[PDB]
Paper text:
In this study, we present the 4.36 Å resolution cryo-EM structure of the human [name] homo-hexamer, the largest isoform in the LRRC8 protein family, which is important to increase the permeability to organic substrates in VRAC. The final 3D map was reconstructed to an overall 4.36 Å resolution (local resolution of the transmembrane region is ~3.9 Å) with C2 symmetry imposed, and contained six subunits of HsLRRC8D (hereafter referred to as α to ζ subunits). Overall, HsLRRC8D adopts a homo-hexameric architecture composed of four regions: extracellular, TM, and intracellular regions in the N-terminal half of each subunit, and a leucine-rich repeat (LRR) region contained in the C-terminal half. The overall HsLRRC8D structure displays a twofold symmetric “dimer of trimers” arrangement; in other words, the structures of the α and δ subunits, those of the β and ε subunits, and those of the γ and ζ subunits are identical. Our HsLRRC8D structure revealed that, in addition to the threefold and sixfold symmetries, LRRC8 hexamers can form twofold symmetry. Notably, we discovered an additional N-terminal helix (NTH), which was not observed in the previously reported LRRC8A structures. It is formed by the N-terminal residues preceding the TM1 helix and protrudes into the channel pore, as in the previous structures of the connexin18,19,25 and innexin20,22 channels, which show weak homology to LRRC8 proteins. The NTH is formed by the Ala5 to Asn11 residues at the N-terminal region preceding the TM1 helix and closely interacts with the TM1 helix. In the HsLRRC8D structure, the Leu4, Val7, and Leu10 residues face the channel pore, whereas the Ala5, Ser9, and Asp12 residues face the TM1 helix. The sequence alignment predicted that the most constricted site is formed by the Phe143 residue, as its aromatic ring restricts the pore diameter to 11.5 Å.
Author numbering:
A (entry chain A): 2 to 59, 135 to 216, 277 to 433
B (entry chain B): 2 to 59, 135 to 145
C (entry chain B): 338 to 433
D (entry chain B): 194 to 216
The structure:
């Protein structure tokens, strides 16, 4: 139930090797690993969950109890003397992983947003397929000339198009800080009960005129395997929030991110063909983080 | 039991980056999440459904029954 | 607490069960209802607003306004067009 | 289907931008 090959096909981009930096690929791949651990937790939780109680002293002891009130009594203890994290963990982990991955990529599939992003990937794909560009770079037929002239006109049309206080930068910032808030949320919660999980549980329900034996104890069956799987989950989310906060705070703080003007200006300064060298609220240094060549050409 | 795979994938459209407003996307993905809730509901409901009764009382009170009753 | 009619079978009339689903199903229920409340509220309010306001015939003057800063004489577009809704993807394709 | 074909063929015509950069 709810496997990785359908949780992935819930949410995936079509073909874009570009517009994924290395940290985004580690976020995607590590989120797939964390979903794998959560689904393994779900399978193991559905497999062998059962608890077992028995009563106190008031050879062997008989106590004259039939089997059926034993399964009633550990049913009743299973919904009273268990912590909420002892049996609601993997399902909440599934919910949080779904929210994490779709908060990773709903920046990308927003309808006001996806238009100009799709159009920009189309622009760069058509811009890479003109051999006049590598001919002029070999310096410093008869079809790509007028093709590149029409593509020039597409380029300075597109240049005049995407000039606002854009939703790309603002959307990506609020997207990153909300998934960082989700990171802070679950790692603030889960420390409290990775601190304290238990194997044996005394219980005193109100079922005294049903069996007797007011005080009796169960053992739970998850404690060792769920505790070890919990600490592996904590390690995975620790590495995730490490990479996220580290690279995303430094990418927010170190540039101005509207300095794509400045980077195309430097490109024009050493390019020997001085380009327009100025551009605002622009996307291209993400592609530079992917590859410098698709920015140069 | 109408598994989740084809129920998820029976909604796809090939080239319609056009012809969807924002709420088409919100309603679509939100209904996918609600489908995930329903499929997990069905699996968990089929897993451990059973109830357990016992009699009132009028050490361990025997009451002298047998398992199949 | 149940009172079944099976009295000449065991000998007991009033007794009780517990039900294994109750807590999980109630929490799953409130999650489902939060999801559907979000669904209906969003889609009701925004579909009310794109039901009442543009009235599905203003695309003619919309293309006239399109022409008004493109230096082309205006044209009356439609009687039945979806071109509003394509407009909600982009202003670009309505202009173009 | 035909309408999406109209617009998806409408977008790439270079005469359109030749006439939009003209007047």
């Amino acid at each position: 139930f709810t496997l990785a090959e359908v949780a992935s096909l819930n949410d995936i981009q079509p073909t874009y090797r570009i517009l994924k930096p290395w940290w985004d690929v580690f976020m995607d791949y590590l989120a797939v690993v964390m979903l794998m651990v959560a689904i393994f937790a779900g399978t193991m939780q559905l497999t062998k969950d059962q608890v077992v109680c028995l009563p106190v002293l008031p050879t062997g002891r008989k106590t004259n109890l039939d089997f059926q009130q034993y399964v009633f009594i550990n049913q009743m203890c299973y919904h009273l003397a268990l912590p909420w994290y002892s049996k609601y963990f993997p399902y909440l982990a599934l919910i949080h992983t779904i929210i994490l991955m779709v908060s990773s990529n709903f920046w990308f599939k927003y309808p006001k947003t996806c238009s100009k992003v799709e159009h920009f990937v189309s622009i760069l794909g058509k811009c890479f397929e003109s051999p006049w560009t590598t001919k002029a770079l070999s310096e410093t037929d008869k079809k790509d000339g007028e093709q590149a002239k029409a593509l020039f006109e597409k380029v300075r049309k597109f240049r005049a198009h995407v000039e606002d206080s854009d939703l790309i930068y603002k959307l990506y910032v609020v997207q990153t800080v909300i998934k960082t808030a989700k990171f802070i949320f679950i790692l603030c919660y889960t420390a409290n009960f990775v601190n304290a999980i238990s194997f044996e549980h005394v219980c005193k329900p109100k079922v005294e005129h049903l069996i007797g034996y007011e005080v009796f104890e169960c053992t739970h069956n998850m404690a060792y395997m769920l505790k070890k799987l919990l600490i592996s989950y904590i390690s995975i989310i620790c590495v995730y929030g490490f990479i996220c906060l580290y690279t995303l705070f430094w990418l927010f703080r170190i540039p101005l991110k509207e300095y794509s003007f400045e980077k195309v200006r430097e490109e024009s300064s050493f390019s020997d063909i001085p380009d327009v060298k100025n551009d605002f609220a622009f996307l291209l240094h993400m592609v530079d983080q992917y590859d410098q060549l698709y920015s140069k050409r």
